[PDB]
Each structure stands twice: as C-alpha cells, then as structure tokens.
Design a protein around this ligand. Sequence first.
Ligand SMILES: OC[C@H]1O[C@H](O)[C@@H](O)[C@@H](O)[C@@H]1O
Ligand SMILES: OC[C@H]1O[C@H](O)[C@@H](O)[C@@H](O)[C@@H]1O
Ligand SMILES: OC[C@H]1O[C@H](O)[C@@H](O)[C@@H](O)[C@@H]1O
Lengths: 302, 302, 303, 248, 248, 249, 92, 54
Amino acid sequence: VTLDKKIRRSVMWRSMFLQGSWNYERMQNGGWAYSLIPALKKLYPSGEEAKEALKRHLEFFNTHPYVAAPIIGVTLALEEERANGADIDDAAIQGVKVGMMGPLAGIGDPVFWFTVRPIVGAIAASLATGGSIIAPLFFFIVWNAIRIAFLWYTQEFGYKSGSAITKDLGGGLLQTVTKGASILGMFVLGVLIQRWVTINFNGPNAVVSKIPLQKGAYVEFPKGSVSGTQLHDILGQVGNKLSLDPTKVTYLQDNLNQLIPGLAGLLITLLCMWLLKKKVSPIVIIFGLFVVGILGRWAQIM
Amino acid sequence: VTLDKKIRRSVMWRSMFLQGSWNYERMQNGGWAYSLIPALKKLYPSGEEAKEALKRHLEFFNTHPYVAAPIIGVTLALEEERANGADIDDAAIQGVKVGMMGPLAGIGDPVFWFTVRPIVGAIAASLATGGSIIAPLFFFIVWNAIRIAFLWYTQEFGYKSGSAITKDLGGGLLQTVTKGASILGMFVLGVLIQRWVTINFNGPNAVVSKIPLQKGAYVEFPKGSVSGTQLHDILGQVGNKLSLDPTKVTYLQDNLNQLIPGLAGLLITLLCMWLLKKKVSPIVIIFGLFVVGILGRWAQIM
Amino acid sequence: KVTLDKKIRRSVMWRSMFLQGSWNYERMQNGGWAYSLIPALKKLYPSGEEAKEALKRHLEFFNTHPYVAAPIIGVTLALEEERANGADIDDAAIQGVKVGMMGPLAGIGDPVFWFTVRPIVGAIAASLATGGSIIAPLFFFIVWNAIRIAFLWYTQEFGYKSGSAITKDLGGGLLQTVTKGASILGMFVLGVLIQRWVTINFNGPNAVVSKIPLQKGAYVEFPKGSVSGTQLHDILGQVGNKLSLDPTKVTYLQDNLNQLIPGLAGLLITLLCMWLLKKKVSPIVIIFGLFVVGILGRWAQIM
Amino acid sequence: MEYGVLSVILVIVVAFLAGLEGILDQWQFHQPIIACSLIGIVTGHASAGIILGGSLQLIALGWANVGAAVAPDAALASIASSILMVQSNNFDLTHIMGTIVPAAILLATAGLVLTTLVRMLSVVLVHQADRAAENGSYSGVEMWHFIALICQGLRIAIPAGLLLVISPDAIQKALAAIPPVISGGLAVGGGMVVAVGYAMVINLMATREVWPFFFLGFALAPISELTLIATGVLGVVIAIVYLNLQAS
Amino acid sequence: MEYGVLSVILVIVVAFLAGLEGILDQWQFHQPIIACSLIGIVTGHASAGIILGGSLQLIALGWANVGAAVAPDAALASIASSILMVQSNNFDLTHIMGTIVPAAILLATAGLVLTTLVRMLSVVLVHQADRAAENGSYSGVEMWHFIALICQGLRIAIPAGLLLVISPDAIQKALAAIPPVISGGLAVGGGMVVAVGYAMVINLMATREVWPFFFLGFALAPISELTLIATGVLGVVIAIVYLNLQAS
Amino acid sequence: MEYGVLSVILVIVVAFLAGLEGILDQWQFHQPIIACSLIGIVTGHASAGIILGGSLQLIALGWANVGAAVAPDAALASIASSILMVQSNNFDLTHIMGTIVPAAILLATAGLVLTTLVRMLSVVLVHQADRAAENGSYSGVEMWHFIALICQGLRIAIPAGLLLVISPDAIQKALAAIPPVISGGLAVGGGMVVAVGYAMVINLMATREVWPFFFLGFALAPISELTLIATGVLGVVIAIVYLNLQASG
Amino acid sequence: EFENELRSMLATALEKDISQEERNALNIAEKALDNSEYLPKIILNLRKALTPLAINRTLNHDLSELYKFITSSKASNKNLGGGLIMSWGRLF
Amino acid sequence: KLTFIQSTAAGDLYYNTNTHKYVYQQTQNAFGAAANTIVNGWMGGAAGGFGLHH
Ligand SMILES: OC[C@H]1O[C@H](O)[C@@H](O)[C@@H](O)[C@@H]1O
Ligand SMILES: OC[C@H]1O[C@H](O)[C@@H](O)[C@@H](O)[C@@H]1O
Ligand SMILES: OC[C@H]1O[C@H](O)[C@@H](O)[C@@H](O)[C@@H]1O
C-alpha cells in the first residue's frame, strides 16, 4: 500500500492514454479507469469492492486532457484514505469530481487548447517558413516535455494536497490565471493576424500609380563592359536608396501597408468573427474563403 | 417655435460659413449672425425685437470655428426660452458667450490646428510618395468625417444641455476623458516631434571627420574590369559588412543621430515652448525660424 | 575645544588626494582614508589607546569614487570632533554614515567624473592636439585640476558645516521610491545590455548545421567574360529581392539561434553564471573558465 | 496645351474654391494635399500634382492662424506652386524640392499679405451690414456676409487666372533670378516651423503625470516600420490601460 | 533509384506510422514539418523534406477537425507532396511553392473524402464490438479497436505504395493537367483560411478589458526583428505587469 | 633622445609620475595627452609626443576603472608607445597608426595585467600597516601607504628603463610573435566574461516583481533603430509610469 | 564558516532586545537564510535596512557587533559586476 | 581577412591575416568617441544599481 513513488511514476506515464475511448453517453470514461487501475489493484485486487470501485469510476468523466493530474492525484489520495482509514462511500468523490470538473475544464481549455497550443504551433511553423529542418524536433522537445513539466508536478502537488484545496479552487487564483492567459493570447493572436494572414493585394492589375522615374532617380546601367568606378557608382546608388528601372509601380497593398500593415487581414478576421457569431459553421466559411480567393486570382487581384 | 430639428440642421449647415466676414476691430461677427439667422426668422421676424436681435448678435465674438457648436446650442436654447418663457435681458447671452469664448478657443485651437491636422496631413502625404490617387481622397474623407461628427454632436449636446449642464460640466467622466486624451496627445506629439521636425545638418562643410580606411576594411574595385568571380566577391563583401570608398565622411547629423535621432528638433520644440510662454506671437517665431534656416543655408552648415 | 580650524581642514583636503595608493582587493581605499584623516585624528587625540582604536576604526572597507569623498570626509570630521569633545557616539554611527553614502555617491560619481567630465575634457584636448601645440596638455591639466580641486574643497566644506542636515535627510523617506525606480531601470537596461553588449557569434569555419546544395535558377548565376549592363541589372535585381550567393547555401548554428531569438546565447550564458554563483562558486573561477573556453572555441573553429 | 480647354475654367473654379476655403477652414480645399491634387489632376498630369501636394503639405503643417495672427495662407501657395509646375513640365522630384517648394513659401508670404489686405477691407462691408441690420432686413446680413465671402475668395482666382496669361519666359526668368541660398534656407525654415505648433499644443497640455508618455512616444518614433496610425493605436491602448489600472 | 534499396521498404513503414498518427493527432507525425522530413531523411535528400515541410506547415496552420467535421487531413497531403517531390527530381523552391504545395491542397481535399469513406467503415466495426461486448471477452474490444486502428491507418499506406509503383509520367501529366488559375486561387485561399481559426480563438477569449492588448500586439508586430518568441515574451511580461499592478 | 643623461632621468621621472597617477587618478599624469606630451618635452621632438598623446587620448576614453574592475591602464600604453616613437626616429603620423598605436593597445593590456598583480601585492603592505596601527604609530601607516604608492610607481618606472635599454625592433617582434589564435580566443572569452558581472548584478537586485522588466528589455533590444539613449529613455519612462500607478493605487 | 556563524549571530541578536523597526529586517534575513538563497542579497538587505537606524542615533547596542560584521571586509560588495559592466563592458 | 582583437572608444584593433601584424582601424571621431563614452558609461551605471544595490 501507501502508493510507492515508482507506482506513482507508472500511473503518471500511463495517464497519457486518458483519451481514445470517446463516446456520447460517457465521454472519455475508459482512460480514467485505465489510469486508476494500478491503485485499485494494489489496494484491493480481485474482489467485489474492486468491481464496485470500477463501477464508481465508470460515470461521466469529461475534462480537459492535459489538466487531469490533479484529478488523478485527488482520486488516488481519496482511495488511499478510504481503503484503510475512513469509510467514504461512492457519493462524495462523484460530487467533488462533478463540482471541480466543469471549472477545471473551463480553465484548462483557454490556457492549453487556445493559449499555449496555437502560439507553440505558430513559433514552430514560423521559423519553418524557409524549410527549416529543426522545426519538427523543436516541436517534439517543446510540447512533449511540457507534459513532463506539468502533468507530473501538478500530479505530485495534488497528491500531496489531497482533497484539502479542491474545494477552495476558484477562490481567486484561477481567475488571475484566466486573465493572464487571455491577455497573453490576445496579444499573440493580434501578432499572428498581422504576420500570418496573407492578403497580398499586389496583382498584375490593381496598380494605383505608374509614374516614370526621371534621370538620376534610378540606377543607370551602361552598355556592357562594367568596370572600375562604374560598378562603384552603381553600387553606391543602389545601396544608398536608389531604385531599379525608371518605372515606379505601386499596388493597393503598398497603400494599405502605408496606412497599417496587415489591415486587410484584420478586416477579414473581424468579418469572419462576425459571421461565426451568427452560428455559421466553420466549414462553409472556409469554402467561401477559398472561393473568394479563387475569384480574386481569376480577377488577377490577389 | 420649439426649434424643430430641421431648423437646427440648417443652422449647422450655414454655420459651416462661420467665417468669411472676418474683421480686426470686430472679429468673426457677421458669420455668427448669419449662422443664427434662421432661428430669429422662426422666432420673431419683422419687429423691433427682430432688429434689436440682429444688432445684439452682430457684435464682437472670436473663437475656434470648430469649437463653436456648444455656443450655438446654448445661444439657441437661451433665445428660444427667452422668446417663449422668461425675460432674460441682454446680459446672460453675452455672459454665457464670453464665459467660454476664451477657454473653448484656447482648448480647440491647438487640438484642431496642430494635433489632428498635422497627423492627418502627415499620413496623407506619407501615402502620397508614389503619386497614389487615394491620398487626397483619404485626407478629405477622414477630415470631413471628424469635423461633421464633432460639430453635430457638440451642437446637439449644447442644445440639450442648456445653460446649466454647460457650466456644471466636469464631473467624473469628463476628467477621465481629459486625462486619457492628454496621454494620447502627448504620445502622438512626441512621435510627431521626433518624426517631422527636420534639422538635417549635412552641409558641404560641417564635415566633422574625414578619417581614412585601410586595406581589408573596404571593398576594393578593380579599375580594369570586374567580370567573373570578382563581381561575386565584391557583392559578398558589400553584403557582409564592408564599406565603400576608403574615406569615411562623418557629418554632424551622423553624430547627433548616434546620440539620438531628432534631438535638434526636440531642443527647438523646447525653445519654442519657452518663447511662447514668454508671450511672443507665433508668427514672429515662424519668421524667426525661416530666417534661421536662411542663415544656416548661407553658412552651408545645414 | 578644538573646533577643527581652517588650516587643518585645508591640510586634510590636500592629503585626501592620496586616497588611492593603498589599493586592496581586501579592503579597498582604507590606507588612503586613514592617511587623509591622519591630521585631524592626531589633533584630536594622539599617542593613546583611543588613537589606536581610531586607526582600527578608519582602516575598514571604503569603496567610493575618490572625487566624491570630500563630503564623506567632511561629515566624518564633523562627527569625529563632536564624538571626541561632545557626544558619546559609539563605534557604529561613523561606519554607518560612511556606508550609507559610500554606495550611492560612488554610483553617481562614476558616470559623472569618469564617463561625463573626463571624456569631454579629453575629447576637447585631443581635438586641438592635432597640430602639436603645447596648449592641449596645458588645457587638459588646468581644466581638470581646477574643477577637481574646486569640487574637493567646496563639497568638503559643505559636508563639514552641514554635518547633520544630510544625516537627517538620509534618515528619512523618499529613498525607497528612488531605490525601486533604480531597480526597475536597472533590470530594463540590464536585459538590453545583455542582448546588445554580449556577442557569442557561433559562425566559425566549421560547425555548420546545414550545407544543402542549390539548383539552376534558385541562386544568382554569374558570367565569366563580361558582366555587362543588362545581366548585371538582372543580377542586382535577384540579389535585391532575396536571392542568395553561390549555390552551396551554408547555414550556421548562429543562424538557427537567431531565428529562434536574437541574443539567446548571451542570455543562456548569463543564466548559467547566475546558477553557478548561487551554487557558491567564486566568480574568478568562472572568469578563467570563460576565458579558456573562448580560447578553445577559437582553436576548435566553432566560434 | 493641357488636358483640355475646360481645364482652364476648372483651374479658375478650384482657385475660387481655395479662396473660399482659405479663411473658413472647413473642407480643406486650400490645403496643399487637396489643392495641388485637384489642380494637377485637372491640368493634365494627375500623379505629379499628388507628388507635389504630398511634398508641400509636410512643410505646410503648423500653418494655421491663431487670434488675428494671419497664417502663411497655403491657399495661394499651393495654387501658385502647382500652376507653375504645370506651366513648365519638370517633375524630376529634384525640381520639386529645389525650385517649387521655396517658391511656394514665397507665394505663401505674398498670400498672407494679400489676405491681410482683404481682411482689413472686409471691415467696411461688415460695418455696412451693421447699418443695414437696423433696417430690419434679415437678407441684408446674409448678403453682406456672402459679399465678404466672395470678395475674399476672389483673391486666389484672380492671380491664378492672371498667371495663365503671363508668358512662361517671364516667370521662368523670375524664378531663376532667385538665389539658391534663399531657396534652400526657405526650405529649411519650412521644415523647421512645425515646432511652433507642436510647442503650443504641448504648452496647452502638459503635466508631471503625462510627460513620460511624451518621452516614450519620442523615443519609439525612429522605428520606421511603425506608421503614424500604428503609433496612434499604441497611444490609445496605453491610455486605455493606464486609465483602467488607475481606476482600480 | 534513391538512397538505398531499403528506402522504399522504410517509406511504407513511415507512411503507415504517419497514417496512424493522422487519426491519433498526438505525435504530430502527420504534420508537414514531420511527415516530409521523416521520409526525406531516408528517401535521398534529407534537407529536401525539411524545406518542403517548412513551406507546407505555414499553410497547414488551422486545419483541425472540430465537432464531427472532416479536416483536410494533412496526413495524406504532406506524404503525397513529399513523395511527388522525391519522384520528380526538381527542388527549385519555386517548384515546391508552385506545383507541390498548391498540389498539397488538392491532395488534402482528396484525403478529406478518403478519410470520410474510411471513417464510415468503422461504424460496422464499433457495431460488432458492441455486439461482442456482452460476450464477456475483454480482449475482444481491444483487438477490434486495434483492427479499426489498422484499417484507418492503411488508407495512407496504400496510396504511398500506389505512387511508388505508378510511372512518373502519369503523375507528371496529372499534375500538369491542373489549371493554374485554380491552383493559385486556392493557394490564396489557404493563405486566407487561418483567419477562421483565429476568429474562433478570439471569440472564445474576448473582453472589453483585453481588447487593447490585442490591438497593441497587432500594432507592435510589424517590427521584423522581433521573432515570435520575442512576441510571446512581450505578451507574458505585459500580462504579469498588468496583473501585478491591478492586484495592489 | 636629444639631450644626455638628463633626458634619461627625465623620462624615468615622467614614467614614475604616470605610474603614481595610474592609481591616484586625479592629476591625470597617466593620461596619454599628458604622459606622451611630457615624454616628448624632455626628449627633443615635443610635437611628435603631443600628436601621439592626442591620437591615444581618443582610445583612452572609456578606460576608467570602476569598482574593483581595473581598466586597460593607459599609463603603460602612453609611456611605452611614446618611448617606442623616441627610439624609432620617424614621426610621419602614418608610422603612428601603423605600429605605435597597436603596440600601445597591446602594452595597455600588459599593463592591465601588471597593475592587477601589483594590486594583489599591495594587500600584504596594507596588512602590515594595519598591524602597525595597533601599536599606535601613525608614522607606520603613513610610511606603508607611501611604500605602496612607491611600488605602484616603480611598476611603470622599471618598464621605462627596460624598454630604453632594449632594441626597438625586439618589442615589435615579440608583439607580433604571439599567435593570432591566442589573441582571438582572449577576445572571444572577454566578450563573454562580462556575463559574470551581469549575473552578479542580477543576483544582487533580482525580485519577483521586476523580472518582467528584465525580459521586456531583453526582448526590446534587437530593434536596431533604438539607440542606447532611446532604450534608457524607455526604461526611465517605464519606471516612472509604473511607480505612478503603484502610488495612485 | 560564514552562514553558520551568521545564523548564530542573528539568533543571539533576535532574542535579547530588538525594536520593531528592525524586527522585520532581521526576520526577513533569517527567513531568506534558512531558505537556500544567495548570501550577498541577504547581506545587502540586512545592511541597507539599518543605515537610517544606525546613522541617526539608535542602532540598538545589542545589534552592534552584527552591523560591524556585516560591514566587514568579506561581507562588502566591491562592485565587481557593476565594474565589469562599466569598465570591461564595451571593451570586447 | 581581419580578426577582431579589441574594441576601444575610437576604433578597434584587428589582426591582418594576409600580413602578420596587428592593425588598428579607427572608426569613431573625437565627438563620436566622446558621445559614445558618455552613453556607455551612463548606461553601465544604470545597468547595475546607481549605488543603491551595492
Ligand atoms: O474539456 C472537455 C473535453 O472534452 C473532450 O474530452 C475532448 O474534446 C477534450 O479535448 C475536451 O477538453
Ligand atoms: O481661436 C482664435 C481664432 O481666431 C479667428 O477666429 C481665426 O483665426 C481662427 O482660426 C482662430 O482659431
Ligand atoms: O566606483 C568605485 C571606485 O572604486 C575603484 O577602486 C576606483 O578605481 C574608482 O575608479 C571607482 O570609481
């Protein structure tokens, strides 16, 4: 008994299979029992009490996948103190799980699914623009080690705390974490909208001006045999500020950038936010965006 | 009576012409009477009181053209109430006009002449570097929208306010709005001072240093010919860190920008602040700055 | 009874010019402090047990900018005269008054004398020394020594006469806000200087993480007979857009580090130094280790 | 000639509109970025007018009158500089900043003195309006306000119309006779003179609590990839966050 | 042929692993940066897949399956793009961006219906698992779960072998038969469609108090020398300072 | 050397004064503009010495020792490089930048090492002075302080004579004989030893409420358009606004 | 040979007689000393929170040798790091 | 090719590889060197405590 630390490590390692048996009547129910198997087998193997413990862990278990270490820890502590000490029936643990699964899911979702996951994927796929070879291994190191950092430390913290602080959750710290995650996520999402939402309006057409540069306003290339002080002068003017051939073509994208870079990306994000507020499904919006891109390219605007 | 809203709309559409009969001995008086004409036409035409109104509304009055809509509103309310109800003599209308003739002109002149006009013009000119057609269009659209919105909302607020709330203004929300607008204005003013106060000190003379380079620290240009791997090597040297002709001319502006960009502009702004605090007319400082620039070009140190 | 008259204070100011010289890595500027206090200490009480207790009292740690130490010496003289003849001040207020204004005064004197006045005077002296004129060393010497002596006398006298008017101010408030603002600015510009002033460029000739080969049309092609005008124009345009040099594209470790975040190696080295210092390791060992590591990395061609 | 025969009457029309817009300052037809663009778009080269207007507006900042202190009156400056541009075809962008902007400043001073004279002239018209007010005629005030309007607005249409008659040789030799030192110094002064308006604004609004925001905006300006709208957004966000934190 | 004889054999194994992951969606093997790189390491040019993986990941952002929906399922798209890249020896980095990455969108579209068809098959497997649930055999549900896993994963292994066996001219002419206005059009659309996921995540977390932070991030982002890790650090420190100041 | 043994003793005296002011750091006899000029006064060509001093002064800016962190010791540079000028009878102002200035910088590093060694040495003398202070002898403390000053002065005086008796070309041969690998490794290790100082000042200031400012400054530094003064202005403004909000709340 | 004797001195000081103004500083020092934290930070906090309490008049005689030991040769700063930033900071 | 050896207030010291001698190249003017020294010193004073963290 006493839940030796090696058994705790085994439970932590096998808890990563919490999902997989996704259902409708009892979503994500098999994995919780699978992760609870070691403690149940150690405390009481091959008995009717084991059967009723399995039945008492078969109910609704629908929490965020990553924040499950505190749940496992409190369940293990309760089972340890009830199989040798107190006589807690299969009613209190169901109550505490129902009470602290909703808010725990609602804090885990906006700090994991939509706060750290998109930003980690973005930093992995931004340096990957130039065909970076490091990006896959970097993602492996940065994400899979996050579970070792969190799902183990929080598991130990919850096991040590028992069920003392499960009732005090939401007493002021969770709101602070929610607010900080929302601030960070809003900041990085604005950055991503600016950076990785390409509405380049250059086009063969959509040219707002075509003024011809005059003599001295562009680099003058001689008629062959480039040599000393000629290549020197040309590099001097090229490096200072001068431009190429005397045609100055500026597109709508240039003016949009001169107002605010990534303005059209922000407008598109606002428009699709408004559309998604009308319960419009993501897929039809995706198809409409693809269609508008198709007709933009057909119009030679995008 | 009751000052139907279409009359107020016409009053604003003719307050568009607040100036035009500008004078020195009796500033900006004809436009005010012309703007208020329809109200008097509706209230009391063709009477001794009508001519008395025309004569007391054609006296000295000077304020910022845009910040005059609260004045129109309070004057409209006072005249309509006096024609319908009380017997307010020719001492409160002039009193209420003079009470905020000063402060409104002092708050609306730098806010509308040298805060929003410079930023709007600077953006419109910055997006007109390539001859883009949308620059005057953007300028007109944004300036007209701001002006019409401000004027209409201010006159409506003044008419609804009357003579009481127009004096008890400044409770709770007004102070916060003032502080926030002041913070925004100081930030944008700092940006403007750094960006669009050009004190370029290049000069044919005023070359602070002319130290020479050494072999291996600048790009060597073959005078005979450059074809072959020589051009590739030259491009590599240019792109890595290497420099042009072995003479480094360091102008005064280069050292100033090494300290901080736009330092002379900040110093000149502080000096103009001191001069204005010493009660000196702005046009005198404008002429003095023109003369200073002329002298700086004379010395060839600009 | 002694009043520490003008002539002995003048001698104290003159002898305070030897504040350095007994420079120690154990107790900085102790011998100079004692040497400058020698006249007043002898005047107040010589050849006694208390004289020995005073010598041991003034031969303790003292680390300040030498120029701003005339206020310290003046306040010390003012405290010491009234300790000898008047009050019963123990051997705790002198050391406290020394330590309280040894730190901030040094921190305000280093950027003003070493990094504000000396650079300006030296630059002016060197600007007019380009012709071999004798007036440049003369100007430097005269200006610097006039300013320094005027400072060392005015501030010494002001510290002596006030005495308590600065101790009361040091004993009050308004210092916590200044200290907190100093800490905030310190961390901000500390991160900035860690990023900027620390460069651990990992280019090297070897230590390449990627030497992929390019292909026809993916780089800038160069002729061999005549670079001409038109194909030179095309080459310049290709280089301008983004096109790379010779087909063997080389990517170094520093390239990947900078695509992660600029200045990461400096931050990591700094954090390792903090950890080692927290693990009770003398900074001299870390300094020697960093020197030998740099030497090896230059020999190993990874740097 | 130019874009068309109707281009001349459109030149006079836009000059008249700039004249009305000079003192009223509602629609900014007198502003160089609007005046130059309108007068160049009609007079053939459309983008040249926009280039000149964008170059001239940057020195036309801080050119507003404050309490009988007559402004340099960009209304005449823009019209005259742009019509001189279209008279002699030279849009090198070195002619623009070499022989047009200083000419614009000199014509601005000329417009300032002209509008001062017309402003003094309007006093007698307003006096006549006051005399007609006692007659009980509501239309008299309107007529003597519009008369002042058109009299002041003609001060830009008259010179612009007269310039199209003047042969280009005379204006060319007059422009060439101006020493280059004067022109360069005028350009430097024009780049300088916005500090007066900036200083006036700072003097109106300044406090021991809002100076740090001024310095933060000043020191974050050399970042060239942050446009003016981006800096405005930064300022609005900083103000909102400051207000939310202080009110807590 | 390629790097080795065992390269083709290992390609099938890596494709099966990628197919299993694409429905697992945990080890991220199905993502382009991993799927392309793993096959490219063995199939000759190791760095060719890394370039393609990085170029395709930036378009494969926000391609998740939400609420009983069918994602484009980059598990097939990345594998097909990489295998077509290695079969046709052209790594110009314009070929990748013009005929490989745009073709990956069409391959993802095909994989969408392919994975829907293979998904509809698992209904019968789960039905018979439910039937055998009451038989009392614990191992039955495990073995049928693994059978469903294998059936769902072979949908990636089979086309990989089909493309390995098929002649290069067939796939080359199939690629050439694609109209390029269509290809560029949905390339633009793929650049666009990140906004859908961005709008979703913004809608989840959005308050009148945290909008200014969004706009500050949007305004401060055009600074090119700030990598996304620097932006994350900016956001974290701003949030910490704001929370510290508010809780005081 | 234009004059006889008089110049021989005068250069030794000037070197002794430079060695004294190296630690005294008040009269600035160790500054190149003074030391080189004085060495040029006593041996013929004053103009050459003044030119060398003016050229070396720009290098000598920022060579101030702060808080037990010794600087590159402009005293030895200014004395030895000027003496090398004196031995090699050419003052074309191209020879200066060609040979003397790099030799000046190398000898500056050598003098930094030597002054660190003598600063370690002086601790024993100060311990003896403290031991004598217990006996109540003021004269003992004064004499031991003077002995420490004398030793630091001789630290520069002795190299002056040794370099006077050594052939002019031997110094350049020895300076150019050190492998470039050693010098480059020393440079690249010096570019990292400052992280030790950064770490100690962090550990002496770190608090959980001010780390965000550290990381904001670290992440806001890669912007090249921000000079050091602009970044310091940002830091001061952040401090002021944060303190204002903290007080108002 | 340093932390243990510092702990002994603080323990002896905090019981004889202490005023409330320096009670907070001494308790903070002990709490950061039993915790494994950097010694120079503890020394700096102990030394800085006593300067007004020392210079003015009070510096309660019980904690006199404690201030003497904290202001000794070993426990001082020497400003090594700040000097390295100032002097050697831009050298390389 | 020039290898970095040391950096001063005005210019840096290099080693020339084509030759075999250390070469000093000057980059900062007297005004520039002085201004850089002022800024570097004040920012190094600000980097650590201004005396309040010693
Ligand atoms: O929190 C609710 C939970 O529901 C399901 O189990 C899955 O969709 C999870 O990803 C989600 O987190
Ligand atoms: O506020 C003073 C006011 O005086 C006059 O009415 C006009 O010059 C205005 O432009 C100016 O703003
Ligand atoms: O700042 C402390 C002070 O201590 C050192 O010993 C001296 O070299 C000074 O240059 C320095 O300023």
